[PDB]
Amino acid sequence: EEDLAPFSLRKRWESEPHPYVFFNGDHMTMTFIGFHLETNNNGYVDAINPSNGKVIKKDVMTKELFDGLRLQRVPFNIDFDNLPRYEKLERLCLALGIEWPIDPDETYELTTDNMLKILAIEMRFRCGIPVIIMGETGCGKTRLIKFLSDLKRGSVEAETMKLVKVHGGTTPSMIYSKVKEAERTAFSNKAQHKLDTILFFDEANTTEAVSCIKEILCDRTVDGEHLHEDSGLHIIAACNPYRKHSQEMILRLESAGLGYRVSAEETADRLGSIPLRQLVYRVHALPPSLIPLVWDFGQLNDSAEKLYIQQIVQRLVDSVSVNPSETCVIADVLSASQMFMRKRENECGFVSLRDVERCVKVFRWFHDHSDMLLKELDKFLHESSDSTHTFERDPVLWSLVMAIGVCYHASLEEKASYRTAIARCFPKPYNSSRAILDEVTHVQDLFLRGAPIRTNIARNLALKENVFMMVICIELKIPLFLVGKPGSSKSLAKIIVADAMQGQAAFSELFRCLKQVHLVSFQCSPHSTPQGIISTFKQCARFQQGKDLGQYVSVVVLDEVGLAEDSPKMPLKTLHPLLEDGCIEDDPAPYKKVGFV
């Protein structure tokens, strides 16, 4: 696209060859990594990459010199498919100049492009080139750099990597203060341990202060003052990609309920002629002289994604007593649901590897509570149905069905296709889509009946879905956003949930076994400052302090966030940090992270 042409046109990906040589720091050897040396029939030796045959750069090495490199015994022409972990680790410590290494993360695998990325980044801030990485949120950027920091520090308890989560409301003064304190602790770490400090700006593309970050690394200056060259300090910046939504979701978004408060041509938040409302990542334009310095990682090509979601699920099932085999059932049903999200021209916001651990958190909530929920479901289905829905339910597979019921099935509009595409992975009690639909229908009926009774109510599928989702995401402190028409029974759900979700003064027994909720409302307006939003968060956190947080949850309910959409006061810009750690301009704590409707 003409407005995304300097950015979206990646002239190359990671999947194009990376022929590297390095001369080792403490050792006196060479590393030939990323390419192979083969013999030509003209008496010359050429560079050929693995995984295909490409004979790029004929006439590079003479064959008697190649024989000489046999004589002085360089580690030449080695593929890193058949090396064990200790040998790859000692090739890393010889190449990265690290003395006496350990293996800091045995779960983190070392394939050959992870070596090339680690050695590439280390070369870039060994010579002086700035390090800017343009990759998506799902790909392994923070894991690779934390492995690099833990490998470069070896064993010392000091603080080497500092990760700054840049959001849209990140002002320049915070970034300047954080670079100065990172510079102070960089001097302190070099003075005590002879060790250098990495400052990792994550998502360094969402703010208007990205040019400020250009001041930090492209010409090495902090608000007019220079950075000391012999201090020991490296700034790595990560950026979100630029792509426009495919047109059908922009159709379903302009028509979701009442439409946007502003139009698409008289809106103020642009990049070129494109609104930021219509982009997948809310990115501002990179300044030039960082465009020829940014380069791309991989994109998680869907083969190794199963491995990463398996490590995440085995680290968050806590399978000391769950199951041996149903963890694999969780893993491949989540892989199938992620592939269903990929087998469509869009996702919501490309939520890969963060929706999965949130959804495993939901599964853990259900499986911890799958003792009274199944008794109440047995009671309800016996008093209100036949013996068809009166079978014994597995307390692990039912929780998985409801996990994908609230993670993926609730937001989608093509729900029946999702159910018939996800039922090919489940075992015997959920082989059909009808069984999953019946199960979520009966448990939504169970939570609507656990509420106090109402007559002349619009008892429909929308009210049941909204009550069910709101009860769960208030229990788990997941934010939920609800757009509908002005008669969608979406504020009636707020009333009946806020009256039913009392802790010990509840009506039924299911809600008596859950948390107490006191909510502070704030009706947004086009004339809304962000200070009111910060005051509402601090007020509900003031309600939440001093109490048992397993039986008390505060939740902010913002009532007209559609009216605060493109207001020039920009009140929702502060919303993105306040939903993550619960407070801006303060260190996180308990009684600060609050629920959000």
Added chain:
Amino acid sequence: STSVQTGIPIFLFKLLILQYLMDINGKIWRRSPGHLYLVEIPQPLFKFLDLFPKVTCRP
């Protein structure tokens, strides 16, 4: 910088030609003959920047 979209010629007219910057609840700034102000602006505006003594830089 490049992300300073909608403020440039008013500021250049105040500081470089009208020689002032004023706060109505406070102090007033006067440009003085005796200091040099270089204003690094990358590249409508292309004609307004021509009014000034200009040092252009090329690849």
Added chain:
Amino acid sequence: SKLDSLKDSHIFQDFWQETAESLNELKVSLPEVLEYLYNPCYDNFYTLYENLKSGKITFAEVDAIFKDFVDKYDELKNDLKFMCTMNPQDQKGWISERVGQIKEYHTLHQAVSSAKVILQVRRALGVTGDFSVLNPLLNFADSFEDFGNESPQFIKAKQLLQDISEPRQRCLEELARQTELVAWLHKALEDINELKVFVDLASISAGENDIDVDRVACFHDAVQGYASLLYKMDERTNFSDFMNHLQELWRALDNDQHLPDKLKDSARNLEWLKTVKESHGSVELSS
């Protein structure tokens, strides 16, 4: 014409939808609606008509079909007039005996549910006492019979529980289900005369907003409405004085129809009511 003569029969619309769910999304033509969909409805309806004209119907169809007519007895008399307008003859001796039969059947099953809830409140209050007259009713409650005839020996037994209602079983189950509060009031409060100082002692520890204040009045009206039962009972009472005090209980019910919801909304505030007496200095001054 026959559907125009039979649209105000709710039973006909029930039969229509329960036999037209027996066909499954089919684009079908009008002349075969009359044969594939109308003629089985008319044949089943005419067999049912000649059944009610004779009286060979069983009790299973009586409580399976006529379930939505309980304490709604004008529509069923009007419905039998519309039902007999199909076949044009007299309607003199057919309606009133079976409407009376359905009224005795409905009050019989209402009396069964009343007997189950009165034995449940007899158990949960701790009063052993003696009734000895609802034993064959319970031996009938797990019995099952299949005939359509008019049960006489129970009529005099049902003269003690004629006019209770379709409500008031709600009141009895709110007594019988809220057991922790009635145990706590026999343990901790023990009499009517401390209520006038207990309301004043609770009105400090309550809040300032309107729900917080009206919890006190809800508790007061709840225990003033049930004080005839939870404080004045001996542990061994017979049935006659039990209904004699329930009589003035019905006088106590006539000034306030909302008393079991007040009992329930007071019964889910037991933790506050436990906090009332043992309250220290609650250091929140007030607004």
